[PDB]
Design a protein around this nucleic acid. Sequence first.
RNA 1: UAAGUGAUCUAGAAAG
RNA 2: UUGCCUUUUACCAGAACCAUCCGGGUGUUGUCUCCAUAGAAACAGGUAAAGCUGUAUUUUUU
Lengths: 366, 108, 378, 357, 159
Amino acid sequence: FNGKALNNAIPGGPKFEPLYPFNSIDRVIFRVPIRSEYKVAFPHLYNSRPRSVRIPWYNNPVSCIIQNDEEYDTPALFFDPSLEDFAPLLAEEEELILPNTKDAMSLYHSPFPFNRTKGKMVRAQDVALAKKWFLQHPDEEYPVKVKVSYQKLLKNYVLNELHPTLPTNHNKTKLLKSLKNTKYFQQTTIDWVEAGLQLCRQGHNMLNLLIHRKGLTYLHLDYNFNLKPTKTLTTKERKKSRLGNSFHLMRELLKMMKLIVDTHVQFRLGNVDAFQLADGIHYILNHIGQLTGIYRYKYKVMHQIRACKDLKHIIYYKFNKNLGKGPGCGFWQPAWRVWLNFLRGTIPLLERYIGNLITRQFEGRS
Amino acid sequence: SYNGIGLKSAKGSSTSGHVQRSLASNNRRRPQGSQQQRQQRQNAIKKASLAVQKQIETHMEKREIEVQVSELRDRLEEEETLSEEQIDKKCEALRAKLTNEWQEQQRM
Amino acid sequence: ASDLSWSKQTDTGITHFRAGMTHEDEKLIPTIFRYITTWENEFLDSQRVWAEYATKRQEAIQQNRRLAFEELEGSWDRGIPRISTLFQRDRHTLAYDRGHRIRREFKQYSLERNSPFWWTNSHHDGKLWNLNAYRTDVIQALGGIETILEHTLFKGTGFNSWEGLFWQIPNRRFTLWWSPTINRANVYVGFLVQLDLTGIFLHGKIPTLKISLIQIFRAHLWQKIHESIVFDICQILDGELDVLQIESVTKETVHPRKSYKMNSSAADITMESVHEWEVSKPSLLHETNDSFKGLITNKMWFDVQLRYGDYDSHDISRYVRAKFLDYTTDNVSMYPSPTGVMIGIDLAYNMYDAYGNWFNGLKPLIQNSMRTIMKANP
Amino acid sequence: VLQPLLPRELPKLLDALNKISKYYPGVIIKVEESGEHVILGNGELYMDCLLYDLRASYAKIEIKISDPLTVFSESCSNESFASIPVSNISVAAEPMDSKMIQDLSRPRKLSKILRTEYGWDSLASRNVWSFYNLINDTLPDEISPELLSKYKEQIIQGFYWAVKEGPLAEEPIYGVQYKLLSISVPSDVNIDVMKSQIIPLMKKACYVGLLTAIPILLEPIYEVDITVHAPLLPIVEELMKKRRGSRIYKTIKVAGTPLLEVRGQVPVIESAGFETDLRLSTNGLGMCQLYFWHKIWRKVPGDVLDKDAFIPKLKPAPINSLSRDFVMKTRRRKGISTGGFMSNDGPTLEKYISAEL
Amino acid sequence: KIANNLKKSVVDIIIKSSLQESTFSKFYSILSERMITFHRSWQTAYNETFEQNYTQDIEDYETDQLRILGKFWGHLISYEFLPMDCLEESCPQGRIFIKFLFQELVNELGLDELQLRLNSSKLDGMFPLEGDAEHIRYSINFFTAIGLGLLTEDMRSRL
RNA sequence: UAAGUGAUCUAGAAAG
RNA sequence: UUGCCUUUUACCAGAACCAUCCGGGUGUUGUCUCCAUAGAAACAGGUAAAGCUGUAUUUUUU
Ligand SMILES: O=P(O)(O)O[C@H]1[C@H](OP(=O)(O)O)[C@@H](OP(=O)(O)O)[C@H](OP(=O)(O)O)[C@@H](OP(=O)(O)O)[C@H]1OP(=O)(O)O
Ligand SMILES: [Mg+2]
């Protein structure tokens, strides 16, 4: 935040758009070459004219000595000092250490995920397997592009941290809950693949219904949600058929979905191995740009795409340390998380957009 | 930006905004050590090059006498000389003996 | 880019270099500034050469001769004004053009297209620069002529040599020339689409390029090419029917789509044999050591696989192999035998290649065939 | 050194400063002649905290700030060779004994005895003292005969002014004796007009003495405390090398843990972002500290009163050029010097005896 | 990151590039200075390149190119070499290169100053004091071609 | 008492 | 407020404001489910088990 607020980017981390648009050489004595690192450390002192600047932490030296294996309670890494019938407490407890306490100590020193032995669940989505890599420092001498990726990720993270989006509480009537309340929905336990395929079928029927309703039957939807015109279009017809950024965006989301669901189908239809599936899914998520022109219609999706790219760059180079190059990495989690959050963002937007669209289809335009 | 030296930000510039340190910086870091012989020669070219002293000497001399006086004071105040006459007498003696010796010095 | 806060106070020695106009795969493009004689040099130089001229003029006078440009060569291109101005085709006309600089200056106030080089005149001072050096150096610096054309669609035209080239319509040409580079396989977000009737996968729309390519393959040209090649192959087989023990060379009539359909492929020619053939394991054309396993075939198939490469996907062999063992081992568009042959032609580079199983003594015929067709298919 | 960003909001800062003073006891807040206020922090972090408090919750004003200067202190190396008097008073000086310095940083007969215990000094010099802050010895010859030498309270205050604002750059005097040698008091004079003369004249005398004493400038030194993991020990050494004038005195190995709580000494000038830099280099395994309770001043290397002196404008000045740079720069800061080009030097007649003859 | 092997080669290349141009550039001079300053190895390289030039390559050049080279060397000489100068017999183009160099030096430093500087140095081939039988005549003669003093003085000394 | 650690923006669709 | 640009969408990325959305917490009610399903046991003690205290020679009591 401080780096942001002063444009004093710490080179391992992010660099932002600037927050804004005596002291002569004759006077001062440049003995210490005053670095940027200091300008964020003691922001109010080394950096004159601070604005909107936070105060960081300051700290104690950590000597958490970790054990390698096959022993307990030993000074290893360090040096040693210069120089009426009753037993003590907890008698008849001969073994000082239990077989788990070697590990328990380790556990105790761990961070927030494992630290503790109870918790509330979180959504797979809500777990950030990838945040902990790029929040901590980049390991050693990755290619420039990966370093850039890291920086990009941090820039995102800081932004997210910085503009707290406090969720409004009064609206505790969810969409699904609302739907559940009515009679016209029932509920079943369906296989996720079944749900997918059914939703492709449903989505396809929806979009075709919409298009035909509009009148422009000459726009043939392919089952792969890749829209194209059947005939050469008369200018009038062409004008009519320029479907907007709502319909196309809907199509693109279904295209996205159709891909991953199709891959699952393939996997489960006996074609491809689970590793192959995982790689497939990963490929899809990291190449949503290249597999479905989502960016075309809603270009802010470039951020999402960029994020995915960054993740890939990060992941691969933690996935391919000793392992060589190649395509066979899976691990689709963080990218998947990105896409989920993009959908979260857009669900409102598409409810509005497609809402208005179908309203126009039904009610005339105002 | 980095150390008062990066581009404000990469937006605008229309470029990476990648910021190398030059390696002529080592030349600008040590040009005095590299071209020490330039100034050294110059320095070499110009490298060859009473009242106050008198005053100091005088101070030392009078000061010495005053030290004698002090010593007298010490001897008196410590070892059996509760009276003022003893002090004054001692001072007088110092003046006479001291300024005698110093008169001798003057003569020489 | 020196320390901006200090630099305002005093001049610094330049400490930190920022990257100006950068690029991925950074070929060090030379500037223009290095190829222009900096003014101070030009002026000291001018003083020298004019002094020399003066001296030689005196010599000429003494000797009573015309001081010809044979003697002053070398200094011809130097000095201000340029020595060339002494012996241009009409000094004795330009002698009476006094007040020239001022007139050039005041063209500013009396014209629409105010000249960019108001400050000098070539008649009076000569070429005050020369950037052929810049041209030459730049071409040398982009891997030479040789290497630039790998970016271009030069390979597509199929000249003997590039050296034999010499003797919104104008920019269309430009776009088409860098077709391969501009329509590139490796690309950021570009969504893949194919142009109509073709295998020209545009990685994100370009209008001009699309217009070009479509005009290039007007009259279903791609399809025609595909069918033509198939016909040729059939003819060849007919010719050499009894040599390779073939019962019947039938063409499996597919939709017109097949020519350019890329997700699937029905086989173009189906090859009914007389006896069982014992085809080799799948391999490329130029892969000589074809392994004859105990597997046999009563029937082969020949498929063509037209493609239009980029500056990134410009190997064909790999692609054709991929195509072969993609469509075989795919449960859409099955061939009558899983054993067969597949040809593919990179139309953008004239890089034929083929992969698949091999009947004994067949390979040479196919190699020769491809060589012939490429040399001259209509 | 604070200045408010807008002169319109100057009174607020003054009020703010007052509040800060009230709240932060360990802050000498000298209002410098220019208006540019000085704030003396204990160290870096404390100073920052002070500034934060000021700039956020008391002032709420944007504030120009000087890079962290250090309170230097003028002094001498040898005894003053000359004894040039002062007029419209000749004060000699010499370096206080290094044991006696320390003794000072924490009944005439008794004091005299003590002095003789400290440095075995003469009873004459023992009797005539009136020290502060360093030592004002009333040690001419006529002073015991004279009672013009009496009523030296005013004189002592003048001496206090000298101590406060030294000759070099209004930098306080430290570790220096002051042997008086004469006084230019004529017969008939009023004690108001005579005393008033002697006060600034005393300052002049002191300055003269300093000049003739081979004056040296003294920077302070933080005593350092660096706990680090043993494996990252030579890194610290390297860093110290990178810093100027930094000494490392004992690497006492802290028992039962990898920490080598090494004491050190960084000059207060060279120290800036030291903690932070150390932390960075050490990968956050080096929770370091700086502090200044010993009052262990030391000579800045290089000699004051040089013409050419140094090379750089931007780069840190060399070791042997340093003192001069500090002096001239500090004079500029304090507004004593005239423009860019100037010099610290003697304001006395005889052409300075033709520059030491 | 060029290793000590080719540093000399790099310097040679740089020199050749300089030669290719119409005239001597401050550019090349500054580059030379920077590299020289950097590491002792590059100083060595520049030196040895100089040796190569006056030894063997020098006589192949044309008066323009040669002149440029001389100028370049003069600029370097004025600061970042010692005036070590391995220099009657050899006067094809080398001597005129020398002329150019001297001209550059004089233009930069100054005449009297230059003399002082050289006086400080050894200067065996340029300024011999031991007569060697009408041999100083040669050097003296050559330096009279350009505006230089002290040749007369030298001859007086020698008789 | 004499070298080279490091900061690396973009990015494509519609309609005109 | 900048950037790409130049015509808008779509956008670049910062700001200040605000909203939407994906979710979360509790607490209380109610339902749904799976298990259940007793209208009386102490007192006198004994048996066994759980919670505290107990094991004079000067200031508490020898
Ligand atoms: O950096 P990007 O433009 O996103 O391209 C990357 C990158 O290729 P380049 O370095 O050639 O650009 C990766 O290569 P490495 O940096 O890892 O060597 C490669 O990753 P793999 O090496 O793991 O294949 C990956 O390819 P893929 O998507 O097949 O994983 C590929 O992405 P694109 O194929 O989308 O260009
Ligand atoms: Mg309009």
